[PDB]
Ligand binder design. Structure first.
Ligand SMILES: N=c1c2c(n(Cc3ccc(F)cc3)c3c1CCC3)CCC2
Ligand SMILES: [Mg+2]
Ligand SMILES: [Mg+2]
Length: 64
């Protein structure tokens, strides 16, 4: 699931996310989602590093 049925984000979606150390937003792909926790792991494009994010903190994709 019911949590997933009411969730906008899905594995593989493009989003943007805050890279907290530099205070700036960057493109990412959602690699994993825990729908109970409402957390995910994103893969930042180009760099390829992974980070946990709250689903609540994901942003609309950067225009491309
Ligand atoms: N692995 C990253 C690294 C940086 N950043 C920040 C950064 C700063 C300037 C820029 F043009 C692109 C990324 C980011 C990631 C992933 C998401 C954003 C800065 C150094 C490594
Ligand atoms: Mg719940
Ligand atoms: Mg669980």
């Amino acid at each position: 699931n019911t949590a997933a049925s009411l969730q906008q984000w899905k594995v593989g979606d493009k989003c943007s996310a805050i890279w907290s150390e530099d205070g700036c937003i960057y493109p990412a792909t959602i690699a994993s989602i825990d729908f109970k926790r409402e957390t995910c792991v994103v893969v930042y494009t180009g760099y390829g590093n992974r980070e946990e994010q709250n689903l609540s903190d994901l942003l609309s994709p950067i225009c491309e």
